[PDB]
Design a protein around this ligand. Sequence first.
Ligand SMILES: NC(=O)c1ccccc1O
Ligand SMILES: NC(=O)c1ccccc1O
Ligand SMILES: Nc1nc2ccccc2[nH]1
Lengths: 187, 185
Amino acid sequence: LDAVRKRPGMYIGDTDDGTGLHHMVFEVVDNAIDEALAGHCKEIIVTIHADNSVSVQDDGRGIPTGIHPEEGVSAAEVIMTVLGVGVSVVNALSQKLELVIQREGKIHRQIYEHGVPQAPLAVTGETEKTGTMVRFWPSLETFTNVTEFEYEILAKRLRELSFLNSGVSIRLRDKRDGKEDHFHYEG
Amino acid sequence: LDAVRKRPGMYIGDTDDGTGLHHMVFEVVDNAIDEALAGHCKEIIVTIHADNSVSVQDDGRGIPTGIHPEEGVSAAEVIMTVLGVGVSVVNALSQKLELVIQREGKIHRQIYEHGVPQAPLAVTGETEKTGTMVRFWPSLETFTNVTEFEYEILAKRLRELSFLNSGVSIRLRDKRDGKEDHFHY
Ligand SMILES: NC(=O)c1ccccc1O
Ligand SMILES: NC(=O)c1ccccc1O
Ligand SMILES: Nc1nc2ccccc2[nH]1
């Protein structure tokens, strides 16, 4: 991840005009949609929290959690810490990031700061759902000037995306004012 | 450098009881001593600054600044960022690290935060002098509970080092209260 840290703008775009910041959400959403697309009920929920973090939930199969035999850490950690630009870029540029994976009846949780995992991916409970959820807090050491998410920027893009991804339900929620949208196209 | 940030304890020592924290200084000092050994004068100065940073100055040749043919960045940057434990460890665990090299008539300067270079090593001026200086501010995300440098802990170790490195003068200064020592065998 140090390559990204060294030159953030080569990976995420302009980190001062808001464009980079919103790219962060779109990269996460891209991964989520690819997760949702590989199930029948396909749903993703994009939430803008009051603390200016964003979470993206998918009801997919759940990112793989097994230990990667070469890297010696969970496959999820590898995905979040190695290398659309990849989710590891979002992680590298987040002051915090919380990963929650439901798979094989288990809840898996990990936390990152600035791309550095605070502990190994841990089974912390049980569940009968499946899916991956990523919530991130953009690094204010990187993103300057425009540091808060614009509901409308997200809405427009999610709506455009809905017509390309048939059968995928996409919900957008803004916890700062209670605004909500649901984009779900026919097919 | 992510393997150090992932388990800093394994590289530097205990990060909650003051062990790791002082060890950051000792690693830097080892590098400085190596440098002072290969020049004339042979002196290092260790300074505790009032803002809980430490600086370690040598009067050595200056560490090399030329571009590293494999890594493609200055050799000094290679030293500060690619994995005694290595000064890269110190750099990785410091919220800020300032590097100043006086080499071949020129002053070179670089700033890191959490081991990330803010810019490439750059020529900033001319000088007569030779030497390397690193000043580092230990990360308060890593180092907890014991977060202020203890004078006498540094003093104890430097004294031992003075006997082992016979020709080297080691000065220790505390800017918080003016305390000072001079260890020279
Ligand atoms: N946020 C997600 O749901 C996600 C899903 C799969 C891979 C990476 C991700 O960030
Ligand atoms: N601080 C020094 O005088 C030093 C000298 C050589 C290499 C790394 C260093 O930290
Ligand atoms: N605050 C902060 N910024 C960082 C950048 C890279 C790794 C760790 C860091 N902690």
